[PDB]
Amino acid sequence: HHDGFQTVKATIDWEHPMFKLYEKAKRNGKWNPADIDFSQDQKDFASLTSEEKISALPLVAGFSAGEEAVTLDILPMAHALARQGRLEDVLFLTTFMHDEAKHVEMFSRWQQAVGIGQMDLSVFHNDHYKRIFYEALPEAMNRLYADDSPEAVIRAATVFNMIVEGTLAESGYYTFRQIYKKAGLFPGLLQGIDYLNMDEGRHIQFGIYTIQRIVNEDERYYELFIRYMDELWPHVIGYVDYLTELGKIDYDLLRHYVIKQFNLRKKQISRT
Amino acid sequence: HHDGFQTVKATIDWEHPMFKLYEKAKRNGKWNPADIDFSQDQKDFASLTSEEKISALPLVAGFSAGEEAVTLDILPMAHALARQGRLEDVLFLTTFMHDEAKHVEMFSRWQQAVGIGQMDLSVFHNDHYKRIFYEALPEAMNRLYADDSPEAVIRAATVFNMIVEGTLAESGYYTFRQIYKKAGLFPGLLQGIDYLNMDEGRHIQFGIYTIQRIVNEDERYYELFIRYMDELWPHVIGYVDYLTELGKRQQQLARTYALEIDYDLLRHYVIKQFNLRKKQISRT
Numbered sequence: 001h002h003d004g005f006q007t008v009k010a011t012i013d014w015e016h017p018m019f020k021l022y023e024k025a026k027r028n029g030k031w032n033p034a035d036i037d038f039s040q041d042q043k044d045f046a047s048l049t050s051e052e053k054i055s056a057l058p059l060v061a062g063f064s065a066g067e068e069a070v071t072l073d074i075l076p077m078a079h080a081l082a083r084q085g086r087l088e089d090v091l092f093l094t095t096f097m098h099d100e101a102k103h104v105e106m107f108s109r110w111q112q113a114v115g116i117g118q119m120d121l122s123v124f125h126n127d128h129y130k131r132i133f134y135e136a137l138p139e140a141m142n143r144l145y146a147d148d149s150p151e152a153v154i155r156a157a158t159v160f161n162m163i164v165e166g167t168l169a170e171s172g173y174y175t176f177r178q179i180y181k182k183a184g185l186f187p188g189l190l191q192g193i194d195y196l197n198m199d200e201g202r203h204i205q206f207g208i209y210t211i212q213r214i215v216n217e218d219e220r221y222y223e224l225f226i227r228y229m230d231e232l233w234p235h236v237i238g239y240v241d242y243l244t245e246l247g248k249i250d251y252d253l254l255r256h257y258v259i260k261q262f263n264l265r266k267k268q269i270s271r272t
Numbered sequence: 273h274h275d276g277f278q279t280v281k282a283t284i285d286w287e288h289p290m291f292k293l294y295e296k297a298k299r300n301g302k303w304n305p306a307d308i309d310f311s312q313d314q315k316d317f318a319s320l321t322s323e324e325k326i327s328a329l330p331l332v333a334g335f336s337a338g339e340e341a342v343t344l345d346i347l348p349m350a351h352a353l354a355r356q357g358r359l360e361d362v363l364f365l366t367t368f369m370h371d372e373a374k375h376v377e378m379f380s381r382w383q384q385a386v387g388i389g390q391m392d393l394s395v396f397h398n399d400h401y402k403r404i405f406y407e408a409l410p411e412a413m414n415r416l417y418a419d420d421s422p423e424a425v426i427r428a429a430t431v432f433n434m435i436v437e438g439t440l441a442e443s444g445y446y447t448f449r450q451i452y453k454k455a456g457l458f459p460g461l462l463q464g465i466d467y468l469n470m471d472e473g474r475h476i477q478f479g480i481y482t483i484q485r486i487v488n489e490d491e492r493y494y495e496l497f498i499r500y501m502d503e504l505w506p507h508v509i510g511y512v513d514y515l516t517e518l519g520k521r522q523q524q525l526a527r528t529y530a531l532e533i534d535y536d537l538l539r540h541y542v543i544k545q546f547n548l549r550k551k552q553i554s555r556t
């Protein structure tokens with residue numbers, strides 16, 4: 001049951017950080033994947049040899065599944081914060097979820113346009129990828145339906161925002177630009193990546209805000225955050241190692257970028 | 273756990289009716305409540321007598337709570353359809369949810385701008401209003417976390433889309449225009465209402481699609497739909513009667529602005545909306 005409503009008893013908290021992020025999301029998140037011209041991407045893909053075609057698919061497989069997972073798996077966080085009365089967080093999260101919908105749409109439109117929509121790309125998800133995206137991510141989010149404790153919320157935001165988005169996805173954009181911008185390939189996909197990267201800046205800000213406001217209640221939660229980050233590292237690097245070996249471009253450059261992002265995300269939360 | 277992912281094994285179903293509705297939502301849902309000029313609304317509200325100021329508040333109280341309720345209460349539907357693998361429905365529902373956020377924001381910005389943000393408007397929710405919005409709506413939606421049966425989904429879409437949006441809110445837009453557009457008052461609120469009404473057409477279409485696809489599986493569910501509509505009517509009309517009674521006890525705004533407010537035409541619009549929603553679902 002609803003006890004009452006914040007915008008009847010009072011108003012939105014106009015100064016709340018998540019209301020301010022919501023306002024930014026509306027002003028900056030206007031792109032439509034349906035407007036991207038993928039016609040040259042189709043011709044670029046056809047120009048590749050069979051071996052070069054295969055080389056591009058593991059990264060796309062990781063992104064399509066990843067965007068689909070985050071579209072579905074943010075819903076428990078929205079529910080948990082709604083149940084806690086965090087209205088401004090909920091408003092922001094409507095933009096987060098609509099951003100992810102666009103991300104899923106974008107990669108799927110690319111697959112369709114280049115002629116691989118009919119190909120099952122699941123073959124490029126190894127055990128480490130599945131441990132994160134098929135298992136750990138939905139487990140941590142769904143937990144929030146029955147357990148919205150600080151510990152549960154930190155774990156959810158750690159897996160979702162700091163690892164999935166802040167480590168793997170961030171490193172994926174970089175990788176795609178290092179390879180394909182340089183090769184002059186897939187301009188429509190790279191335009192989509194640029195819009196997506198802008199959206200995801202907001203998503204990471206929500207994760208940092210959420211983790212830090214809980215850590216501020218108790219430094220014991222800081223140690224939980226670091227432990228959950230380290231818990232998932234073997235799977236992050238296990239997936240990275242798998243893509244790197246498929247790749248055979250400076251792969252050690254890309255690998256160190258992943259490590260850089262992982263340590264960066266840790267440093268964006270303060271014990272204090 | 274996720275078994276796999278549709279956009280890895282295949283693609284989005286580009287022809288799915290809810291993918292098409294999602295596409296329309298992106299194209300047509302561009303407005304931003306933060307861009308509405310409420311400065312004239314502020315002046316209008318201040319120029320009103322206390323007894324004219326009051327006349328508008330019961331309707332605004334109904335919409336602010338309603339929009340906040342639907343913002344929160346759509347989440348279980350999105351979850352239930354997601355768990356069923358209905359990806360295109362989920363994509364569309366992201367636009368539904370972000371629409372509702374804008375609707376909550378819009379009415380809250382109006383209240384803030386006109387100087388009533390600090391006033392507790394709960395006093396204009398009677399028992400019938402509370403049975404719909406404080407109780408029946410969240411109960412029917414939350415049910416979906418543990419019971420996503422066809423019966424549960426039809427009941428959820430009936431309460432949310434056909435009654436709350438398709439009968440009450442639709443009648444509220446009409447009432448607001450019948451009163452304040454003719455008066456020449458609250459231009460920013462009216463702009464917001466117009467944007468909102470456009471969004472809500474899609475929300476009702478989602479409800480029709482959802483109910484109809486379940487009725488298509490088994491025509492027995494059509495009688496469930498009709499029954500659930502009829503179960504809620506006493507509270508729809510109980511709330512309408514309450515707002516009508518309030519409006520008839522304060523007629524200064526109508527006298528001042530020469531509006532022959534026909535509450536019996538509004539009451540008949542509510543009845544028309546209710547019966548019209550029923551006709552939009554067919555047995556076969």
Ligand SMILES: CCCCCCCCCCCCCCCC(=O)O
Pocket residue numbers: 059062063066067070100103164165168169171172175200203240243244251254255258
């Ligand atoms: C060889 C260098 C490895 C680079 C790492 C590539 C990782 C693939 C990215 C897939 C994760 C996508 C998750 C979506 C998160 C979001 O968009 O919010």
Ligand SMILES: CCCCCCCCCCCCCCCC(=O)O
Pocket residue numbers: 331334335338339342372375436437440441443444447472475512515516535538539542
């Ligand atoms: C005197 C005529 C009575 C007219 C009825 C007024 C009803 C007020 C509307 C409040 C419900 C708002 C619910 C929001 C639903 C949505 O926008 O999705």
Ligand SMILES: [Fe+2]
Pocket residue numbers: 070100165200203
């Ligand atoms: Fe994201």
Ligand SMILES: [Fe+2]
Pocket residue numbers: 128238
């Ligand atoms: Fe391994």
Ligand SMILES: [Fe+2]
Pocket residue numbers: 342372437472475
């Ligand atoms: Fe709606």
Ligand SMILES: [Fe+2]
Pocket residue numbers: 400510
């Ligand atoms: Fe009554």
Ligand SMILES: [Mn+2]
Pocket residue numbers: 067070099100103196200
């Ligand atoms: Mn994304």
Ligand SMILES: [Mn+2]
Pocket residue numbers: 339342371372375468472
């Ligand atoms: Mn609405």
